[PDB]
């Protein structure tokens, strides 16, 4: 949910 | 002379961060079509910036991919290794895939890097 994160 | 308009070649290529800028504009209010269509073009015009690969393979885990994933995740990791994010990502695409040990140890990874 972190790693969905879009940076 | 030339060279010089190389560098101008070069650092014009701000362009990729705008398409990713949108890319992800697109990936957040769930327009993942597009979001690829952005990432495509920011890659096209650079290039060796990790991050349209690893947001491009995200959107592809979103739309069922996992090998498109897993290869773009690869190349985010080729071109930088510390970005924990594209390890996650590749994990889950793996762990969707059936590569249950290289998820594993890119998930591991992910706990290496952040912790």
Sequence with gaps: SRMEEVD | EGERKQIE?????????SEKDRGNGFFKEG????????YTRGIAADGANALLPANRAMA????????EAEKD???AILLD??????????????????????????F????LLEP
């Design chain 2, 31 to 38: 327009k993942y079509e597009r979001a690829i269509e952005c």
């Design chain 2, 60 to 67: 592809y885990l979103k739309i069922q991919k996992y090998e």
């Design chain 2, 73 to 75: 995740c690869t190349q």
């Design chain 2, 9 to 17: 070649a070069q650092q014009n290529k701000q362009q990729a961060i």
């Design chain 2, 81 to 106: 290794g510390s970005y924990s994010k594209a390890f996650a990502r590749r994990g889950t695409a793996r762990t969707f895939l059936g590569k249950l040990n290289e998820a594993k140890q890119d």
């Design chain 2, 108 to 111: 591991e990874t992910v706990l």
